[PDB]
Amino acid sequence: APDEITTAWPVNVGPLNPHLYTPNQMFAQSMVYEPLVKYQADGSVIPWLAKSWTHSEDGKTWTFTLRDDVKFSNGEPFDAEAAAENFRAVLDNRQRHAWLELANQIVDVKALSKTELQITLKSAYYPFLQELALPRPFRFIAPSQFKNHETMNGIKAPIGTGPWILQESKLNQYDVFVRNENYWGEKPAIKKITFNVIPDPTTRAVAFETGDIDLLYGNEGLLPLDTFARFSQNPAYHTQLSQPIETVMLALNTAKAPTNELAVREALNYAVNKKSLIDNALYGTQQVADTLFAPSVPYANLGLKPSQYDPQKAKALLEKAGWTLPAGKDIREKNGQPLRIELSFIGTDALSKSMAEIIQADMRQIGADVSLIGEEESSIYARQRDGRFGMIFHRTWGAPYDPHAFLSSMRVPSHADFQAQQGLADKPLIDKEIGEVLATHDETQRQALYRDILTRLHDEAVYLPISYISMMVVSKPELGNIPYAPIATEIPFEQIKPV
Ligand SMILES: N[C@@H](Cc1c[nH]c[nH+]1)C(=O)O
Ligand SMILES: N[C@@H](Cc1c[nH]c[nH+]1)C(=O)O
Ligand code: NI
Known part of the structure; x- marks a missing residue:
């Protein structure tokens, strides 16, 4: 019929x-x-x-x-x-x-x-x-x-x-x-x-x-x-x-080694060729994401500094942080420990698996050894809430959750965000200001709180933004x-x- x-x-x-x-x-x-x-x-x-x-x-x-x-x-x-x-x-x-x-x-x-x-x-x-x-x-x-x-x-x-x-x-x-x-x-x-x-x-x-x-x-x-x-x-x-509705990124675990070092997180942000990733995995159909939220999201047009693909910078950051190449190896070492990071994703998801492979290859060029752990959806959600991840695919929620409901959720183990943010010294302040952004009736104060929250999250390299999806x-x-x-x-x- x-x-x-x-x-x-x-x-x-x-x-x-x-x-x-x-x-x-x-x-x-x-x-x-x-x-x-x-x-x-x-x-x-x-x-x-x-x-x-x-x-x-x-x-x-x-x-x-x-x-x-x-x-x-x-x-x-x-x-x-x-x-x-x-x-x-x-x-x-x-x-x-x-x-x-x-x-x-x-x-x-x-x-x-x-x-x-x-x-x-x-x-x-x-x-x-x-x-x-x-x-x-x-x-x-x-x-x-x-x-x-x-x-x-x-x-x-x-x-x-x-x-x-x-x-x-x-x-x-x-x-x-x-x-x-x-x-x-x-x-x-x-x-x-x-x-x-x-x-x-x-x-x-x-x-x-x-x-x-x-x-x-x-x-x-x-x-x-x-x-x-x-x-x-x-x-x-x-x-x-x-038009794009939400951001797809990695959440980096600030409370778990080695992603607990700012310099590692920055280096990771520099190592990935997003354009090449998008052209190849997303068939050029989506755009490159520089920030947790796109500048078209209310309150998020903040002129945050983009991290461009720069493996040279990435490897320099790591060097200063004490991650060096031992003789005979291509993976970096600090205190006898290899720079290993665990990337968890839904094993049955074609796009994640494909992006993960690309990302892994990209990080190897800076001496980081990324291990792919593709698992069942429920196991992935479990890792998001208990913090058992090095890096994990994650996305924002679209209108009208973005940005206010999405920030709110950061304050408790909901998706990955709470856990990913645990290692940050200014985590309690961030949670406090999130609460204040939900409370204030003054637009001017709200603009400032959003700038401060989003700027910390950005500057502390909590995320690795990949793309904005449609x-x-x-x-x-x-x-x-x-x-x-x-x-x-x-x-x-x-x-x-x-x-
Ligand atoms: N965690 C909330 C918000 C959300 C929107 N999209 C994904 N999550 C829910 O699933 O209902
Ligand atoms: N909020 C869900 C996860 C989810 C998937 N899609 C939307 N939400 C949960 O924790 O069970
Ligand atoms: Ni949800």
Whole structure:
């Protein structure tokens, strides 16, 4: 049928618990569950599940007027008490959400009326509405689907209020979404969406060529990039490559030898030929990243000094730092210890593996011995949180997490960042200023705090920025131009109009 589409994703969508993370896929969570306010391209929010709201004079107590015509997909009603139960179920696992400051800010959530929801905060927290608009965790499953009054330990059926329903899910094969015919808002033209679980990038390309796939949508790992370029030349196909949405880099571990020496981290930053890396691994399709955030990110246009490819400088830095070449070897030594660094990455990811090989070859030219450790995704995430890495692939999160939610998350073991920053003398100051950037209502103070935080991180060579990556689309021409969602982790299926 024309109003049905088939697409692909490398893994199943997961249980679609609205209040957990791995292995739930964010775009899928955003198809089924909804927020109180909805994020916009211009950077604002609009009323969503909340029709309107008011706030106390001190800005700590917020009262939302919800919509009254909203039902979960199973018929049960969405009301303040339902909302209140969700927030409660979230905050029971508050430590897990500590990366997002709103989770540490909510003091109390009370259902006043059927339509009146009251939230109480520790402070007049300015990112309040924006953080409510995020995919997760502050979105709403039917309280009837809790397991023993909790969500943190699992849910029953993923029942939400969103315009899509998870109808069927088969492990390593497919997930199927049907339009929710009792959705409170405008109805999507598409009635059915079938996600074929196809882990391999090359297989995803082949599947598209068969005619069986209407739409591929995702980041730079979606298809091999030489194939995508080929596809873009094909008048029978449609392709798109958005403007950059986020940074891909290495996180260097400042608390683990030898990446604990500033001079090693700087030397590493000088050793990699990023342009050559990008041309070769990314097929010239992306741009070179010099800083944790691109200068187009709010608050990040700071004129930070780029590290250019300079192996001469790199080897000079190392020499001064006492890392010398012993007779008969090409790897440097300091106190009888070889300059070994462990680079961990997801072994099944083609792009990471390819970049890692390039990077390893680059560092060998400065006398650094990089060992590649490709592992399962879960093992990689585990190393990110406990700090068991020398260098680790890492990326930023896109709008609207960048930069504020991403900096916030640095303060706890969330992704790699906290652990990578442990060895820095000024780490406690950085964490303090991050807190202050989230607290201040003065733009001028916020500009300064961002400059100070981002400048330290840059000058202390915590990261090795590689590239700024894009979204890509491959589609049948009959679907027309495919739009992008304001939240980079969401896919705007509800906006696709078949013929
Ligand atoms: N935040 C997730 C990791 C993740 C992958 N993609 C998005 N987030 C976790 O720690 O479980
Ligand atoms: N750690 C948060 C934020 C994030 C956005 N993208 C990846 N992570 C989450 O996974 O929900
Ligand atoms: Ni995450």
